[PDB]
Design a protein around this nucleic acid. Structure first.
Lengths: 125, 198, 204, 176, 96, 93, 32
RNA sequence: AACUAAUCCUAGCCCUAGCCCUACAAAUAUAAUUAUACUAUUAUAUAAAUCAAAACAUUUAUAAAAGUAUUGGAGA
């Protein structure tokens, strides 16, 4: 869940459960060379690496061994016609290593007449 | 933004209406939804234009410019496939017709009779001729996308017809979250401490 | 929107010696089995379409279309011919002046074969003497003679959209018989370039 | 599963993938609360897979097959949320009568404007929270000049739009 | 989690959201719907409709029988307080 | 300078329209109405100059008094400053 | 065209409304 | 018939009239826009001067009666 308030927890409170998840993630081909088990993911900035582990393990039943995440700064050099800087949306790249000996490789998605020139050929005259 | 024959947002439209355009505004007389009487598929007679006096069926209506498009009428000639290798082939290209340039046709008598909007027993609004009052029923036109709802066959990720129409909701004094707990039987005895909202 | 279709539904095969040649008219009667059912389809929408009288109406359109070229009457020519015919006629005549005239027809025009949601296509046989002279932008003569008649035999196909209430007979294409003589040569001279080769490559 | 993040292998390389219309609000209302919760995940799973494919398409600089599929899913998800929210909203009014899920009230800011203030959760009461008391909900005396400007500005706005309308009217007279 | 004194992170299990994933087996609803299926006119649910569907039948039966009193409003489904429920309608105590 | 290469759009004026044709009617209200209503009473315009005329300073001063209670603070202050400059020029030079 | 009706001043007694803020004080005096 | 250039009409405004007004989520005064404790929380005296009196000093405006009676380095 993103862009929402989570209930404040105090001693003796229930466990926090998100019945419906607003986090949306996309699998991306690794730009750098990574181990085959390692997988790159683009996730919302408010999601934690633990949430991704729970997200994959619960929603997709994918076993995860290790996770490494980075935040990419979006370029703001670009400017519009009005001279207002345009900022690329910042995104987080998550390197997820599979567990149970599983291996991953990015799927291969998207597998007139020449003798008489200048006179229209229509003329027979 | 001046609306044109090209669909808004197209590459040609961007050239036609750049953000920095400051040309003299074009005047289009505002027409109310009740006032407007021209719809796609309606047989109308061109009051004025290149093909004035020829009855045709509407195929596109740009209400922003009060333009009615008749296929094969008010039609000019242009080259299709004009390229370096080939000279090109003439084609017939339609030009926009303003709303006042066409009038609806009475089916019984083929004439450009002025019409007035009025409801029917079924409740559907129908245009009625001011003179020789008659009911001009709404014409039947195929869906623009070409998809016939009945002919459509479910593909992958598409529910069957019966499944979608099934009603399972049972009115009760419980929210979705509570209902999900009841079905799944989640049990939690902890309770949040008081929170001072302010 | 298209009011004509490129190509010919059924290509009529001209027989050698037809120029020398009642007679051929009976051959259509013999071949009415192939064409009369097509003739009925044109007749159904029109009912006045007859192979005997059609050529006169078609001939006027053919002659008129050529006349528009002399006056560059593009607007008029569009009505006379179908959209397929127009690009061929006028594109190569840009920035050129042509004097075209029609000498008396050698033989009467006769319908030859017809084969049409419905575009009736009628093949017509025409032999006529004409005069042609084309000049450059500067007025220099580049093709044809101003006042010399050339006898030309060709088969002309007209096409009308039967379904449309506004459909009319407009010239669509010309069928050229193989036995027809070659066209006159151009006054100017052309050069066929030699093979183009890179510095590494050598002439062969 | 990882396969769920990607489209059907058969569909890969196809110009489009056949898909139907999005779920309408009325149909979702007929569905039960438990059914609505399940459908949200089903739509979400399809949405994520389409997002994954679209991102790869952008990287490959290739067109996305049947982009309307994502739009249909998003519309269905939005329809689901409101239908569920409608049931939540109706019950909240019945049991409590509060027109908003979050406690709030109308308060005056330091600029003299009246704005709805959404209450925040705190572990201590307001009087024991100095920082909350530090927050200013009162207007300074100098705002009186601003209040007059706001009334004048509102009057000025009416004049400007009328002037703008007059210029548009010139087009009507000029064109006709 | 919570950052306590000495700059030490201590994760709190309760504050960590847990994704409750429903079982999609046996569920007949899919992301898209047939073009063959007619669309339903939108009828947003309101408190009047919710009360009529759920609460009205009980009171109507009770009113005819005469077994109705003000003290037993909770009997027909009124909640005196939202405390004790995991999901509280107001103030909202659960995430989307 | 360079001048237009096209003529301005033609203008057609109706000299017998209701406004022009009936302009001035009832201007003799006083003599033809027994002088019950003075022709100055037929003046339409700003309130402070209906039936009255004066120089700009008098007009501005009369405007301030007539709608001073309805004048904007910004406008009233600006008018006072302008009047101050006008007063010195007329009454001292 | 026909000229509009001549302007006429309303005759007869007219009583100003005392409660109205706009009405001047002197118009509400006994002298009035 | 030439390059540089030039050509255009509304973008809009101005003055009166009329009219008082009562037009998403998330985050925020802490370090504003930082989802929860810290640290209590708070504007403003005649308006003056410039200016006029050719400097400068008291002084210097901000319906008719009438610019009259009066006031004033009796001077602006």
């Amino acid at each position: 869940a993103r862009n929402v308030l989570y209930p404040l927890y105090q001693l003796g409170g229930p466990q926090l459960r998100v019945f419906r998840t607003n986090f949306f993630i996309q699998l991306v081909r690794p730009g750098t060379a990574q181990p085959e088990d390692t997988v790159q993911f683009r996730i919302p900035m408010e999601m934690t690496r633990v949430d991704l582990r729970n997200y994959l393990e619960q929603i997709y039943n994918v076993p995860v061994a290790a996770v490494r995440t980075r935040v990419q700064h979006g370029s703001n050099r670009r400017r519009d016609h009005k001279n207002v800087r345009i900022k690329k949306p910042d995104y987080k790249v998550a390197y997820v290593q599979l567990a149970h000996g599983q291996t991953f490789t990015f799927p291969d998605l998207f597998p007139s007449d020449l003798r008489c020139p200048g006179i229209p050929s229509w003329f027979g005259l | 933004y001046r609306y044109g024959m090209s669909r808004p947002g197209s590459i040609a439209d961007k050239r036609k209406n750049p953000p920095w355009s400051r040309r003299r505004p074009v005047v289009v007389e505002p027409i109310s939804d009740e006032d407007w009487h021209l719809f796609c598929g309606d047989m109308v007679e061109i009051l004025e234009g290149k093909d004035a006096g020829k009855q045709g069926k509407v195929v596109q209506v740009v209400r922003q410019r009060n333009w009615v498009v008749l296929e094969g009428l008010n039609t000019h000639y242009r080259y299709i496939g004009r390229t370096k290798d080939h000279r090109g082939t003439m084609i017939a290209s339609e030009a926009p017709l303003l709303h006042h340039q066409v009038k609806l046709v009475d089916p019984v008598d083929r004439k450009p009779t002025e019409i007035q909007w009025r409801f029917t027993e079924a409740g559907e609004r129908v245009r009625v001729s001011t003179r020789s009052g008659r009911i001009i029923p709404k014409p039947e036109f195929p869906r623009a996308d070409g998809i016939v709802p009945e002919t459509w066959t479910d593909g992958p990720k598409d529910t069957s017809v019966e499944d979608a129409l099934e009603r399972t909701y049972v009115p009760r004094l419980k929210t979705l979250e509570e209902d999900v707990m009841e079905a799944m039987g989640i049990q939690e005895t902890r309770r949040f401490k008081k929170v001072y909202w302010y | 929107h298209l009011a004509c279709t490129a190509g010919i539904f059924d290509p009529y095969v001209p027989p050698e010696g037809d120029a020398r040649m009642l007679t051929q008219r009976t051959e259509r009667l013999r071949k009415n089995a192939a064409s009369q059912l097509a003739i009925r389809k044109i007749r159904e929408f029109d009912a006045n379409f007859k192979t005997k009288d059609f050529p006169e109406k078609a001939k006027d359109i053919f002659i008129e279309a050529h006349l528009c070229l002399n006056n560059s009457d593009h607007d008029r020519l569009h009505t006379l011919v179908t959209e397929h015919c127009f690009p061929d006629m006028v594109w190569d005549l840009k920035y050129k002046t042509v004097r075209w005239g029609f000498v008396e027809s050698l033989e009467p025009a006769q319908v030859v074969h017809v084969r049409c949601n419905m575009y009736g296509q009628v093949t017509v046989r025409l032999h006529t003497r004409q005069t042609l002279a084309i000049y450059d932008r500067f007025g220099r003569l580049m093709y044809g003679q101003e006042d010399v008649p050339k006898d030309v035999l060709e088969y002309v196909v007209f096409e009308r959209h039967l379904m449309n209430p506004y459909g009319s007979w407009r010239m669509h294409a010309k069928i050229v018989p193989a036995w027809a003589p070659p066209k006159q040569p151009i006054l100017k001279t052309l050069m066929i370039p030699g093979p183009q080769l890179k510095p590494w490559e050598e002439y062969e | 599963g990882l396969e769920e993040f990607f489209d059907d292998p058969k569909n890969w390389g196809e110009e489009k993938v056949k898909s139907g219309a999005s779920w309408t609000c009325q149909q979702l209302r007929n569905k039960s609360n438990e059914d609505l919760h399940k459908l949200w995940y089903v739509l979400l799973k399809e949405r994520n897979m389409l997002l994954t494919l679209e991102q790869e398409a952008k990287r490959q600089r290739l067109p996305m097959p049947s982009p309307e599929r994502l739009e249909k899913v998003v519309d269905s998800m939005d329809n689901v949320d409101k239908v569920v929210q409608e049931r939540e909203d109706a019950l909240r009014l019945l049991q409590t009568g509060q027109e908003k899920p979050r406690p709030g009230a109308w308060r005056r800011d330091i600029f003299g404007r009246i704005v709805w203030h959404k209450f925040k959760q705190w572990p201590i009461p307001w009087y024991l929270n100095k920082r909350y008391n530090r927050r200013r909900f009162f207007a300074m005396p100098y705002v009186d000049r601003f209040i007059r400007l706001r009334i004048e500005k509102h009057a000025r706005i009416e004049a400007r739009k009328r002037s703008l309308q007059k210029k548009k009217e010139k087009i009507l007279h000029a064109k006709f | 989690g919570i950052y306590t004194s000495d700059r030490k992170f201590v994760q709190i299990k309760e504050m960590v959201p847990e994704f409750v994933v429903p079982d999609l087996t046996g569920f007949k609803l899919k992301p898209y719907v047939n073009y063959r299926a007619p669309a339903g006119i939108d009828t947003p649910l309101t408190a009047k409709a919710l009360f009529q569907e759920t609460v009205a039948p009980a009171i109507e039966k009770d009113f005819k029988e005469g077994t109705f009193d003000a003290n037993n409003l909770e009997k027909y489904g009124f909640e005196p307080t939202q405390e004790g429920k995991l999901f509280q309608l107001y103030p909202k105590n659960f995430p989307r | 300078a360079f001048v237009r290469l096209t003529l301005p759009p033609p203008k057609v004026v109706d000299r017998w329209n209701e406004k022009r044709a009936l302009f001035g009617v009832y201007d003799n209200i006083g003599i033809l109405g027994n002088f019950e209503k003075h022709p100055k009473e037929l003046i339409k315009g700003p309130v402070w100059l209906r039936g009255w005329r004066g120089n700009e300073l008098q007009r501005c001063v009369r405007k301030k008094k007539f709608v001073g209670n309805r004048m904007f603070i910004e406008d009233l202050h600006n008018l006072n400053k302008r009047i101050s400059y006008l007063y010195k020029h007329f009454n001292r030079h | 065209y026909r000229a509009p009706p001549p302007p006429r001043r309303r005759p007869g007694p007219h009583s100003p409304d005392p409660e109205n803020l706009l009405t001047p004080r002197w118009q509400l005096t006994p002298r009035y």
